[PDB]
Design a protein around this ligand. Structure first.
Ligand SMILES: *[C@@H]1O[C@H](CO)[C@@H](O[C@@H]2O[C@H](CO)[C@@H](O)[C@H](O)[C@H]2NC(C)=O)[C@H](O)[C@H]1NC(C)=O
Ligand SMILES: *[C@@H]1O[C@H](CO)[C@@H](O)[C@H](O)[C@H]1NC(C)=O
Ligand SMILES: *[C@@H]1O[C@H](CO)[C@@H](O)[C@H](O)[C@H]1NC(C)=O
Ligand SMILES: *[C@@H]1O[C@H](CO)[C@@H](O)[C@H](O)[C@H]1NC(C)=O
Ligand SMILES: *[C@@H]1O[C@H](CO)[C@@H](O)[C@H](O)[C@H]1NC(C)=O
Ligand SMILES: *[C@@H]1O[C@H](CO)[C@@H](O)[C@H](O)[C@H]1NC(C)=O
Ligand SMILES: *[C@@H]1O[C@H](CO)[C@@H](O)[C@H](O)[C@H]1NC(C)=O
Ligand SMILES: *[C@@H]1O[C@H](CO)[C@@H](O)[C@H](O)[C@H]1NC(C)=O
Ligand SMILES: *[C@@H]1O[C@H](CO)[C@@H](O)[C@H](O)[C@H]1NC(C)=O
Ligand SMILES: *[C@@H]1O[C@H](CO)[C@@H](O)[C@H](O)[C@H]1NC(C)=O
Ligand SMILES: *[C@@H]1O[C@H](CO)[C@@H](O)[C@H](O)[C@H]1NC(C)=O
Ligand SMILES: *[C@@H]1O[C@H](CO)[C@@H](O)[C@H](O)[C@H]1NC(C)=O
Ligand SMILES: *[C@@H]1O[C@H](CO)[C@@H](O)[C@H](O)[C@H]1NC(C)=O
Ligand SMILES: *[C@@H]1O[C@H](CO)[C@@H](O)[C@H](O)[C@H]1NC(C)=O
Ligand SMILES: *[C@@H]1O[C@H](CO)[C@@H](O)[C@H](O)[C@H]1NC(C)=O
Ligand SMILES: *[C@@H]1O[C@H](CO)[C@@H](O)[C@H](O)[C@H]1NC(C)=O
Ligand SMILES: *[C@@H]1O[C@H](CO)[C@@H](O)[C@H](O)[C@H]1NC(C)=O
Lengths: 99, 50, 454, 49, 99, 420, 49, 50, 50
């Protein structure tokens, strides 16, 4: 809400999983604190330890195939997006009505 | 000055048929006019020579 | 039959040859009761025209009107089409506002205009653009009438582009110039040909706004039809020298031949309906105190005086005479091109530019380019006669082909070119952003000095 | 295609296998779906894929 | 701090948040030469690949004829404004009116 | 300091209400120094002398507003066309209040004809909203006309673009014929039972007789007609259970007269707020050039927002009609028009009356059949579709594959090899 | 699909001269050395091989 | 000849704000056309010199 | 925050050199500043392995 009536529906929450030909998640440049521009930023919910549940969001770089697909869709469909990772695990498995 | 459809699409869109059971060429042309489903065949093009 | 003739003040045409347009005309006169009533009028008010209609309809049962206009009021044609929906008399609108393109004719009227539709004139203008190979263009349309089917025909033509026409999106103006929102729509144009669709004074204001904003360069072309232009005799201010217009009011093919051919068509229709039906005079007696055998659905096939003067299904001529003009540096609308029977021919295939548009516009954008036939570099091929279009990854070029071995005359042949150097020139025109002037060599090979002569 | 030594070439090319594809799972009721499908068929339909 | 150090802080914010597509709107406000010059010597000397739109200049009180078009020639994300406070009120009111 | 106002009206009571509303218009609207006068024309059958009296009373009066106010003219053509065609000589807007046709809706055919009465395309949008209520998609459209039928089809395609979907079947024909029963039988074999009709009285009576003959008055038939279909013998031929629409306060004359007076008055005052106002000159004396502030007057009139009105919030759209007009959903029950709902704005308000369908219960009949039968079209595909001629008559040899699986053929029907 | 693309113009002009009705016509033509190449789906051509 | 006649207030006593029509005065002065002069023609660039 | 050339360009632009007679890789960037001669040698790139 910058004003009273402003439609903001172009925001797309996007989560992915690390795959070596598709989703290459690597470190940031330790000298400039900058992802190289063909990569995109991501945050990873890294917890403190196994006892607590709250944690920080480590910012990392992302290249690969699906990153290129997402960039070309953002060129074509012209949307906005937020990239992050899930820590529950792999793609999907319903553990007794719990995915 | 209109390009209309003939053949299987021209008979389906006219309501003469209900389903084109055929090796459908799923492309960007026919996607703008009808809806699609998931493909059964995963096949590429190549060149026949002698 | 009894046909009335009334005009305004077009082309300073005297009324004397109108009264003398009966003697040698209709030498094979099979209908006997064919006479003319040729008059004039000081003004162009439609109420006096209705008064003359009600005077001449009861005036010994006049069964015809040939009317021509000198002004630019298309509503008079609407009033005459309404009268033709009441009197049910075939009335020929010749020129001026009486023959201008209205929106949608009705089957309940027998009024006939002369010429072609606005879609056929758009087809002729796109044929000009195909012959000149100018593919990146724009389209500025106002709320001027007849816009719906015209824009729809343009959209269906661009969607059916074998040429691959690059049409910039439709610049729409709901009202006149706001100088806030319409200026932004005018400054979105970076194409070559700008197509304007409005009235005459609105075109003057839009060209004045474009000249005040520098949008009237020789890169920015301007092509308007006859209905946007208006009177051929009146040339108002803020016109770029090279203003392409398409009309039919030729000074060589004047009003007298038009009205003589129209009377020939009317007497041909009377003779053709007389040999089929007997009681030809069927008109309303008087206008005060208020559909069997007509000529509306009867004269589709007609060819008078050799030339095809047949009627379309939408109330126009099948093959009219089209005149394509430009503006010179002497403020004169000079005739350039005419139309053939089926296709379109052009005299000035070589295109002059008429550099004097403003105080200073240099021609530094264009570069004279000549090359030689090289199989990996300059691939020269024929133009396709089925399309009359070099495909968009090829570029056209002209060649001075001499006819005989001992003559000094030679024609210009346009041929397609693809290859490596074509791609180099296209990428240079992408990056350096210049324009090219491509043609072929006629003297021979690369270069050799033959006694201080290269 | 990145194997050191290149001593592993799999049997066949999916002829005796599942031979499925990869897609984008959208939520049931998203208006983005037709636009994403047209964008993917444009990305395949020009050689860019 | 100087205006160059504060521009360094703002570009450090933009580097930490990776908003590469930006613009630059500078009025006749004082210090405009060194400010635009430092933006040039920071973006052009950067290894990041910042998408730099050209500089939009506003001379005087707006005619709302050409300045409207120059504001509507901005399709980037970050709009850097360089003016006074009341001029910022006027330019933000014009941008709210122009959307 | 006087300005005449042209009206096509003959009743002295409505002219008295008109002059009282003019006196109200000159009362509180500022210190502007204009005076106003009325000039109205009466009933004449001869439309040529109608246009003659109109142009004689428009040229010799210097009017600003032209209000045609006779819908029930005894001429069956119903043409207020020559008034607007005469006023288009100076691009003068005629603000008529009579017709509701799409042939009058054109800004290109009629040059500057404004109005506050909407055509049947707004009824099509109300029907689209009703389909959004009842959650239906597939229709069967039958339009008798072709002039307004193309505009109705374009408005339907606009509503489909709002839906981002497509309709099922549209049809147009020539009025006067009587064997359009075959098109109704072709529409019977579809997968929907929603019928939308755009017709006059005669075509509606013809298709109601066809519905009585083809058993189209059974269960599930969703009938949806408008204003020209609920009059004459078609009202007698209408089945009990048909749904009609009627906009409120249109047939009551004086209230929309007063609303038009308020609109015209506030438009004239907001036009005369500014300077350099020209006047339409006398066309009979030396004045053939166009009125230069025509598009200026159109910019003032087409962008005039109003908060006053007896009917409600009146506002001109992009085509010069009434934004969000009120409507009444009527139903036919034992040859009686029973009111079963209303529609303002964007919202449907059904009352506590029984919405009775021509079939069974008061709930909506879903005419989307289960579609047990399908039609498979194909080509002779060389890896896929193997076509073999039959042995004796329509029979297939029960052959086996290499694994004992019997080749389950099908009796298909194929054309020739080359079609021309 | 080739008429849309940016460089397939000469191949489009070559293929438009001798378009065939059925694929069996193309098989018989390339069998009788009337054709010399044909664009077709791969597994169908493997089955025909 | 034009409107919006603004005056700089007396900043010594009870006037602290800025003169808001500064760029208005710049639009007036920097866009001036000259065809007469004793020493000659003066003309304004973006800097406003001779 | 300024980038500078050095090496052979640093020796040439300082006036301490007149002509760099060396088969230099003629690129676009170094030709944007100073004028270059006609390339006499046509030579590409290669990879040395064991
Ligand atoms: C009758 O007219 C009004 C006109 O506005 C409409 O009311 C709108 O609908 C929502 C529904 O919740 C109401 O909250 C608002 O009062 C109105 N909103 C807007 C933007 O106008 C509606 O069509 C009808 N009345 C009702 C049912 O509210
Ligand atoms: C807690 O977390 C850290 C990483 O954040 C890691 O060393 C290990 O998981 C735990 N050990 C401690 C106490 O740091
Ligand atoms: C949490 O548990 C894992 C698995 O036992 C192990 O690495 C370690 O005990 C803890 N540290 C983290 C955060 O992995
Ligand atoms: C009307 O007639 C007069 C001469 O009486 C002439 O001067 C004038 O030009 C005419 N009007 C028009 C429109 O030509
Ligand atoms: C004109 O003649 C041709 C050929 O006889 C025929 O089509 C028809 O009679 C006329 N044209 C029309 C209306 O098709
Ligand atoms: C065009 O038509 C006219 C009239 O029929 C004819 O005389 C002329 O030869 C034709 N020209 C050509 C060659 O198209
Ligand atoms: C020119 O000379 C050549 C060779 O004699 C001859 O074949 C040709 O017909 C002549 N005509 C031309 C092309 O000028
Ligand atoms: C000139 O060329 C034309 C066209 O080829 C040919 O008909 C003519 O005979 C030539 N002239 C001579 C006499 O060589
Ligand atoms: C109003 O118009 C009528 C008809 O033209 C006229 O008789 C009457 O005098 C006019 N009244 C005034 C003074 O406005
Ligand atoms: C309409 O025409 C068909 C033609 O077969 C005929 O069978 C049918 O009886 C006709 N119906 C009417 C209403 O006359
Ligand atoms: C058709 O008529 C029969 C008469 O018994 C009736 O039962 C049925 O509801 C009607 N509806 C259909 C199926 O058309
Ligand atoms: C029209 O509406 C007004 C105001 O509601 C009312 O007084 C009048 O009686 C109505 N007239 C008719 C004919 O219903
Ligand atoms: C009145 O004058 C203005 C300029 O002040 C100009 O737009 C036009 O000439 C006229 N129209 C209106 C009402 O703005
Ligand atoms: C419909 O009638 C209601 C009565 O309250 C009114 O508020 C509303 O504005 C009307 N709708 C229109 C715009 O005709
Ligand atoms: C279609 O055409 C042929 C023509 O002889 C006919 O004999 C046969 O019944 C059909 N055959 C094919 C190819 O379908
Ligand atoms: C005065 O300022 C206002 C607001 O900028 C502007 O609309 C108006 O045209 C100005 N008048 C003049 C001519 O000074
Ligand atoms: C500059 O010098 C020329 C030549 O003496 C003179 O005509 C001109 O008036 C001078 N410039 C001025 C004073 O405008």
């Amino acid at each position: 809400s910058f004003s009273d009536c402003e439609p903001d529906d172009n925001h797309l929450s996007i989560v992915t999983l690390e795959e070596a030909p598709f989703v290459i998640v690597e470190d940031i440049d330790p000298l400039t604190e900058t992802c190289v521009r063909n990569t995109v930023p991501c945050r990873k919910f890294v917890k403190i330890n196994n006892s607590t549940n709250e944690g920080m969001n480590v910012k990392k770089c992302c290249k690969g195939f699906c990153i290129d697909i997402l960039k070309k869709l953002s060129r074509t469909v012209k949307f906005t997006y937020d990239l992050y990772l899930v820590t529950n695990g792999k793609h999907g498995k319903k553990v007794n009505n719990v995915w | 000055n209109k390009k209309e459809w003939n053949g299987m699409m021209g008979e389906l869109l006219s309501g003469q048929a209900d389903m084109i059971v055929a090796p459908l060429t799923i492309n960007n042309e026919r996607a703008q006019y009808i809806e699609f489903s998931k493909p059964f065949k995963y096949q590429g093009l190549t060149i026949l020579v002698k | 039959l009894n046909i009335a003739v009334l005009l305004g003040h077009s082309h300073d045409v005297t009324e004397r040859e109108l009264r003398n347009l009966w003697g040698p005309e209709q030498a094979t006169g099979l209908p006997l009761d064919v006479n003319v009533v040729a008059l004039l009028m000081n003004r162009t008010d439609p109420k006096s025209l209705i008064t003359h209609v009600c005077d001449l309809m009861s005036g010994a049962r006049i069964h015809g009107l040939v009317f021509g206009d000198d002004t630019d009021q298309e509503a008079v044609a609407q009033m005459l089409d309404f009268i033709s929906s009441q009197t049910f008399i075939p009335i020929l609108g010749i020129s001026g506002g009486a023959s201008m393109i209205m929106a949608d004719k009705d089957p309940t009227s027998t009024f006939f205009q002369f010429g072609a539709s606005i879609q056929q004139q758009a087809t002729v203008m796109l044929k000009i653009m195909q012959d000149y190979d100018w593919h990146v263009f724009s389209l500025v349309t106002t709320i001027f009438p007849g816009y719906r089917d015209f824009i729809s025909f343009i959209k269906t033509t661009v969607d059916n582009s074998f040429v691959g026409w690059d049409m910039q999106n439709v610049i729409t103006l709901d009202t006149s110039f706001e100088d806030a929102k319409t200026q932004v729509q005018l400054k979105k144009i970076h194409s070559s040909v700008i197509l304007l669709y409005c009235s005459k004074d609105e075109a003057v204001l839009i060209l004045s706004e474009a000249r005040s904003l520098g949008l009237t360069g020789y890169d920015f072309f301007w092509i308007v039809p006859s209905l946007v232009s208006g009177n051929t005799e009146l040339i108002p201010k803020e016109f770029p020298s090279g203003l392409i217009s398409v009309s039919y009011d030729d000074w060589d093919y004047s009003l007298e031949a038009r009205v003589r051919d129209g009377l020939g068509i009317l007497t041909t229709a009377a003779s053709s309906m007389l040999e089929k039906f007997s009681y030809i005079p069927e008109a309303k007696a008087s206008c005060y105190g208020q559909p069997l055998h007509t000529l509306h659905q009867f004269m589709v096939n007609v060819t008078w005086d050799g030339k095809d003067l047949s009627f379309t299904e939408e109330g126009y001529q099948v093959h009219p005479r089209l005149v394509v003009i430009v503006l010179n540096k002497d403020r004169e609308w000079e005739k350039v091109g005419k139309w053939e029977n089926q296709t379109l021919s052009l005299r000035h295939a070589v295109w002059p530019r008429y550099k004097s548009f403003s105080d200073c516009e240099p021609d530094d954008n264009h570069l004279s380019i000549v090359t030689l036939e090289e199989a990996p570099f300059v691939i020269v091929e024929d133009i396709d006669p089925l399309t009359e279009t070099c495909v968009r990854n090829t570029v056209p070029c002209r060649k001075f082909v001499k006819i005989n071995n001992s003559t000094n005359e030679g024609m210009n042949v346009k041929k397609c070119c693809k290859g490596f150097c074509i791609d180099i020139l296209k990428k240079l025109s992408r990056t350096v952003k210049f324009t090219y002037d491509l043609y072929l060599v006629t003297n021979g090979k690369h270069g050799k000095k033959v006694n201080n002569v290269w | 295609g990145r194997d050191e030594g290149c001593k592993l070439v799999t049997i066949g090319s999916g002829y005796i296998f599942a031979t499925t594809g990869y897609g984008i799972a959208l939520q049931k009721g998203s208006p983005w779906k037709r636009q994403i499908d047209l964008a993917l068929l444009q990305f395949v339909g020009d050689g860019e894929m | 701090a100087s205006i160059q150090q504060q521009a360094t802080v703002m570009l450090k914010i933009m580097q930490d948040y990776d908003w590469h597509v930006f613009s630059l709107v500078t009025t006749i406000f004082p210090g405009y030469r060194d400010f635009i010059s430092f933006i040039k010597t920071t973006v052009d000397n950067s290894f990041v690949g910042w998408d730099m739109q050209n500089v939009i200049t506003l001379d005087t009180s707006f005619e709302d004829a050409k300045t409207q078009v120059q504001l509507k020639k901005i399709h980037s994300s970050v709009i850097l404004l360089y003016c006074s406070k009341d001029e910022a009120v006027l330019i933000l009111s014009e941008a709210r009116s122009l959307g | 300091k006087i300005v005449n106002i042209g009206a096509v009206l003959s009743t002295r009571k409505h002219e008295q209400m008109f002059r009282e509303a003019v006196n109200q218009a000159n009362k509180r609207h500022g210190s502007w120094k204009i005076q106003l006068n009325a000039t109205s024309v009466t009933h004449k059958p001869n439309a040529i002398q109608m246009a003659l009296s109109v142009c004689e009373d428009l040229i010799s009066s210097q009017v600003y507003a032209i209000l045609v106010s006779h819908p029930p003219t005894p001429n069956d053509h119903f043409t207020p066309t020559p008034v607007s065609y005469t006023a288009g000589f100076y691009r003068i807007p005629v603000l008529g209040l009579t017709t509701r046709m799409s042939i009058y809706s054109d800004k290109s055919i009629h040059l500057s004809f404004l109005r506050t009465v909407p055509p049947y395309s707004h009824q099509s949008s109300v029907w689209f909203e009703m389909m959004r209520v009842y959650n239906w998609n597939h229709i069967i459209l039958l339009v008798s006309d072709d002039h307004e039928g193309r505009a109705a089809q374009k408005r339907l395609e606009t509503l489909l673009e709002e839906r981002e979907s497509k309709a099922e079947k549209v049809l147009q024909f020539d009025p006067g014929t009587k064997n359009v029963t075959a098109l109704l039988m072709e529409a019977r074999e579809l997968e929907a039972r929603v019928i939308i009709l755009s017709a006059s009285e005669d075509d509606a009576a013809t298709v109601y007789r066809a519905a009585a003959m083809l058993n189209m008055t059974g269960s599930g038939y969703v009938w949806l007609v408008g204003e020209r279909e609920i009059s004459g013998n078609a009202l007698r031929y209408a089945p009990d259970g048909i749904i009609g629409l009627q906009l409120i306060n249109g047939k009551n004359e004086s209230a929309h007269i007063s609303d038009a007076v308020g609109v015209v008055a506030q438009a004239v005052h907001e036009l005369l707020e500014k300077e350099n106002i020209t006047d339409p000159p006398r066309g009979c004396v030396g004045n053939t050039n166009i009125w230069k502030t025509g598009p200026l007057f159109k910019r003032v009139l087409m962008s005039s927002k109003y908060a006053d009105g007896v009917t409600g919030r009146v506002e001109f759209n992009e085509d010069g009609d009434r934004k969000f007009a009120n409507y009444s959903i009527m139903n036919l029950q034992n040859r009686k028009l029973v009111q079963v709902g209303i529609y303002n704005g964007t919202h449907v308000i059904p009352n506590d009356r029984k919405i009775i369908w021509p079939g069974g219960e008061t709930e909506k009949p879903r005419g989307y059949q289960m579609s047990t039968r399908l039609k498979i079209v194909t080509i002779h595909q060389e890896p896929f579709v193997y076509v073999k001629p039959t042995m004796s008559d329509g029979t297939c040899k029960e052959e086996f594959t290499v694994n004992g699986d019997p080749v389950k053929k099908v009796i298909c029907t194929g054309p020739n090899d080359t079609s021309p | 699909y080739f008429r849309r693309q940016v460089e397939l113009s000469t191949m489009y002009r070559h293929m438009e001269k001798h378009n065939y009705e059925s694929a069996a016509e193309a098989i018989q033509a390339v069998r009788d050395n009337k054709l010399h190449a044909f664009i077709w789906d791969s597994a169908v051509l493997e089955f025909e091989a």
